[PDB]
Design a protein around this ligand. Structure first.
Ligand code: DZS
Length: 483
């Protein structure tokens, strides 16, 4: 559960909640009202409340006085299990999550919605066990379920800040009620079991109507849709044990940003590790970090082994005076050996938004192993935020796609930035969605947060901010308009 996240509270309301409803060790996280894009961790310690800032410019979550993380749920899981890690220099403990009662970011909550439109939505998109919770219709709520086929409506009374379906147990929140009737299904007198199988889909849209949905999300709606996706990240806390191994620690750009064990690229004492994951839609990708001096050779073993023929670099080598990805390729016309691997930089070609490097990769002492690797280096992504126009990114991705398509039996496309999750996730999700539209045509169903959630189950925190989220919609909108 991610109930420690309160999406609609101020710092004063947070301080009040922790002082009146929490104890020492109580904590919650919330979006920043003063800096819309950032987050705050409010913790109760020795009768007082601290407000620790969490910054996210697009590459990772950076906790002031703590570490860098891929998601807020990964950050919380870490600090709840490892005490003393968070700190004037005094240790701050995350012991008791202070739960949010607000139903706003739950997949099934529709707020203002009529019984007519709820039936409309459930008749179209719904299936057996599909449900939603909406406002009544007054000050009360309604649970609407599809079974079979038919739609049943169950009134939810709100009496003295508690919720009930007219008898039995009274719940502190709509969530506790929903979870309770998910496990203990309501039974109609004639035997109809009101099973709450899955929430109703509100995000899947026909590609041709992207303009109408984007116009509706710009009224913001994007923030709410993104936060509903963010709440689902508690389901993706898969093991990341291989990256924790002593011998693997310094092969990670960031100690607490790790590849999932079940999707990590295994390299064939400890020579099998790289911070990289295979990304498979529903063309494959390898989402990886920018190289470290001690991982350059592992990077080339990975490219060779996977039969990758295209590399997408989404950052400049240096941004804001800091190394984003070390130079792992030779100078134009040069030949270098990186362990057992040999690389020639054949030719460099400059475009407006990017540089192309034609590289030849082979294994030392085995001439017949040579293959060309095309490195597409995107150089115009801004220092902060996302591009103001998606044209550049789209034209680049179109070129990468055509290169990948021209090569028989080419392995996955390697995509890398700094931590390999923000910009990397954005380029990959755009490429995936735009690939749907190439095959199926403008007559296809697209579901942006479902695509994101699918990529996130393969590598932690793929697509980091709401700005990237909106950029993905803008890029999909631009591509369809140019069709
Ligand atoms: O053993 C399993 O089957 C299993 C299943 C699910 C999992 O989420 C994990 C697991 N994988 N990584 C983690 N981290 C991160 C961590 C620990 C050490 C150093 C750096 C980093 Cl960044 C946790 O803090 C963590 C905390 C509690 C419980 C599981 C955790 N966990 C393992």
């Amino acid at each position: 559960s991610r109930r420690w996240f309160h999406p609609n509270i101020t710092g004063v309301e947070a301080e009040n909640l922790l002082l009146t409803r929490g104890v020492d060790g109580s904590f919650l996280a919330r979006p920043s009202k003063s800096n819309p894009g950032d987050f705050t961790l409010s913790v109760r310690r020795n009768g007082a409340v601290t407000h620790i800032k969490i910054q996210n410019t697009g590459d990772y979550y950076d906790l002031y006085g703590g570490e860098k993380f891929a998601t807020l749920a990964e950050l919380v899981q870490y600090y709840m299990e490892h005490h003393g890690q968070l700190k004037n220099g005094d240790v701050i403990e995350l012991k008791y999550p202070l739960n949010c009662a607000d139903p706003t970011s739950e997949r099934w909550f529709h707020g203002h919605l009529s019984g007519k439109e709820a039936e409309k939505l459930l008749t179209e998109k719904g299936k057996h066990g599909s449900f939603l919770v909406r406002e009544s219709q007054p000050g009360d709520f309604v649970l609407s379920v599809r079974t079979g086929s038919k739609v049943t409506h169950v009134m939810i009374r709100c009496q003295e800040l508690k919720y009930d379906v007219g008898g039995g147990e009274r719940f502190d929140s709509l969530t506790d009620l929903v979870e309770h009737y998910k496990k203990n299904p309501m039974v109609e007198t004639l035997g109809t079991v009101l099973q709450l199988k899955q929430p109703l889909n509100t995000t899947r849209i026909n590609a041709a109507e992207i303009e109408s949905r984007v116009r509706e999300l710009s009224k913001q709606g994007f923030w709410e849709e993104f936060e509903t996706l963010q709440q689902q990240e508690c389901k993706l806390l898969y093991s990341r044990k291989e990256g924790q191994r002593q011998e693997n620690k310094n092969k990670n750009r960031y100690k607490n940003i790790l590849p999932f064990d079940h999707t990590r690229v295994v390299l064939h004492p400890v020579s099998d590790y790289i911070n990289a994951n295979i990304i498979m839609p529903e063309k494959s990708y390898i989402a990886t970090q920018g190289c470290l001096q001690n991982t350059v050779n592992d990077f080339w073993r990975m490219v060779f082994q996977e039969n990758s023929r295209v590399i997408v670099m989404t950052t400049k080598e240096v941004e804001r005076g800091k190394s984003k990805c070390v130079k792992y390729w030779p100078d134009e016309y040069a030949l270098k050996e990186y362990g057992v691997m040999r690389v020639r930089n054949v030719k460099e070609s400059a475009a407006h938004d990017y540089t192309l490097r034609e590289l030849k990769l082979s294994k030392v002492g085995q001439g017949n192993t040579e293959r060309t690797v095309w490195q597409y280096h995107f150089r115009t992504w801004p220092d902060h935020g996302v591009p103001s126009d998606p044209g550049g990114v789209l034209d680049f991705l179109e070129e990468v796609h055509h290169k990948q398509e021209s090569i028989m039996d080419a392995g996955p496309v390697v995509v890398h930035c700094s931590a390999g999750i923000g910009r990397t996730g954005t380029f990959i999700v755009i490429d995936i969605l735009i690939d749907i539209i190439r095959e199926k045509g403008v007559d296809c169903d697209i579901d942006v947060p479902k695509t994101i959630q699918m990529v996130r189950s393969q590598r932690s925190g793929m697509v980091q901010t709401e700005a990237q989220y909106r950029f993905i919609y803008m890029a999909v909108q631009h591509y369809i308009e140019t069709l």
